[PDB]
């Protein structure tokens with residue numbers, strides 16, 4: 635590929651992200667003022683783990699669907715054999731969900747957008763997995779510190795998915811070729827935007843992988 639083609643890849647990854655990002659960043663930021671009352675919090679805390687599980691599983695499944703749509707629009711992803719498409723989404727979709735969450739997270743008050751309003755980790759109490767929710771909130775907290783642009787998320791999450799080191803891949807060389815082009819697309823766009831500094835500030839490789847493992 636040439637540099638003009640990599641620019642086309644950047645714009646295309648950024649486009650596919652915008653068309654699949656679930657909620658507009660605009661709306662998410664506007665709603666930061668809209669916070670669950672103490673009574674609303676208590677309403678969530680009173681629900682059984684079973685109701686909370688059902689709701690959360692629904693929102694998660696929905697988010698994963700958007701991730702799958704995003705991957706399907708990535709260049710060459712549809713050209714991969716069905717086995718590798720599945721391998722890559724299985725290992726990487728949840729990781730993408732967790733990176734995308736940071737757009738919906740307000741570090742000023744450690745709250746997250748959930749079912750129309752912002753709420754803290756205590757909203758999820760009935761699930762009885764406070765270590766997990768706190769680790770999910772803390773990861774969003776550290777990502778929010780970097781002020782990820784929409785295009786940085788698009789390109790970074792394309793790379794979370796297109797990773798030739800996933801076990802079980804059958805056409806490893808094809809995935810590699812896609813990965814290298816996306817790596818150069820990312821580096822090149824950071825240089826275009828004077829954002830080279832975020833490279834050293836990214837989650838250490840394995841952090842994201844192990845947070846979704848025990849999940």
Ligand SMILES: C[C@H]1O[C@@H](O[C@H]2[C@@H](O)C[C@H](O[C@H]3[C@@H](O)C[C@H](O[C@H]4CC[C@@]5(C)[C@H](CC[C@@H]6[C@@H]5C[C@@H](O)[C@]5(C)[C@@H](C7=CC(=O)OC7)CC[C@]65O)C4)O[C@@H]3C)O[C@@H]2C)C[C@H](O)[C@@H]1O
Pocket residue numbers: 655656657662687690691693694697731732734735736737738746747748749761762763766770848849
């Ligand atoms: C490990 C132990 O787990 C024990 O049960 C567990 C397991 O079954 C696992 C089970 O997973 C939950 C849990 O992970 C929490 C999880 O909670 C979900 C809802 C809350 C989330 C914080 C979270 C992460 C994505 C995040 C949502 C909130 C949404 O509004 C978003 C902000 C939304 C938006 C994005 C955007 O850009 O705009 C809006 C899309 C998704 C979103 O990014 C997923 O929902 C999942 C279903 O939690 C149970 C308690 C049993 C044993 O003790 C076992 O040994």
